[PDB]
Amino acid sequence: MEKFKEQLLEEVKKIVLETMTKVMEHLEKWFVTLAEIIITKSEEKLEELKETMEKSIEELRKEAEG
Amino acid sequence: MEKFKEQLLEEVKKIVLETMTKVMEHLEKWFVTLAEIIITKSEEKLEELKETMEKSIEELRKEAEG
Amino acid sequence: GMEKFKEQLLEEVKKIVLETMTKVMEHLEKWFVTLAEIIITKSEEKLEELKETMEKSIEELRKEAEG
Amino acid sequence: MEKFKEQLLEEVKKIVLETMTKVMEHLEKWFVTLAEIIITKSEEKLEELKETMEKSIEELRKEAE
């Protein structure tokens, strides 16, 4: 049952990968807004970062169900 | 035949997504207390960060059992 | 009997997971380098970098998902 | 014979929970280090964060083997 092994395991590496690509975009945004906080140090920019991360996990939550 | 492959793969993708988003809920706290230590330079908030990552991680470990 | 197959298969599941997460960790570690750069210096040129770097990380990740 | 699937799912659930906790450890290390370079902006901490990130990725590299 190697067709089973091959199909299943190659497809799986694919999905782990894609999901990562997404958690990476998000993280990216977290990093850029975080850099903005670094440059300015603004409770404002921090509430911004909060709202972002919140919409990001809103997105993930969404996707994880399907 | 293939219908079983289908079912297994989907449950797999889901599991990934669940685990990832749980990580993202964690990354969240980590980012925001990080932004705090950015803004106030707190040695106390440094401790708060260390403490919170410690416990967050332990709460990560306790899922793998099962 | 069955247990043999099952074992091998889970094994390579854990394998592919380990490999892809080490890749994400390499991306993240670059991210941390330029981010700390911003911490110590606070030059915005560095924010232009960081943008470019995240972008090419997610770029290559899309590129890998496309086997 | 769905019980095959049953075992397989529990196992993978496990496997992934675990791989994520191993990466999370090194992130925590990197966050301890980053917070301390925030307080004290020393190239010392800089080069030393490089070293730790390094230990982590290689630990995980050999691990795939």
Numbering used by the authors:
A (entry chain A), B (entry chain C): 4 to 69
C (entry chain D): 3 to 69
D (entry chain B): 4 to 68
Share the article's original sentences.
Here we use deep network hallucination to generate a wide range of symmetric protein homo-oligomers given only a specification of the number of protomers and the protomer length. Starting from only a choice of chain length L and oligomer valency N (2 for a dimer, 3 for a trimer, etc.), the method carries out a Monte Carlo search in sequence space starting from a random sequence. The loss function guiding the search is computed by inputting N copies of the sequence into the AlphaFold2 (AF2) network, and combining structure prediction confidence metrics (pLDDT; per-residue structural accuracy, and pTM; an estimate of the TM-score) with a measure of cyclic symmetry (the standard deviation of the distances between the center of mass of adjacent protomers within the predicted structure). To eliminate such over-fitting, we generated new sequences for the HAL backbones using the recently developed ProteinMPNN sequence design neural network (accompanying manuscript: Dauparas et al.).
To evaluate design accuracy we attempted crystallization of 19 designs and succeeded in solving crystal structures for seven (three C2s, two C3s and two C4s). All crystal structures had the correct oligomerization state and closely matched the design models (median Cα RMSD of 0.6 Å across all designs, with resolutions ranging from 1.8 to 3.4 Å). The side chain conformations in the crystal structures also closely match those of the design models. HALC4_135 is a coiled-coil composed of helical hairpins reminiscent of HALC3_104, but with C4 symmetry instead of C3, and a discontinuous superhelical twist. Despite its simple topology, the closest structural homologue to this design has a TM-score of only 0.59.
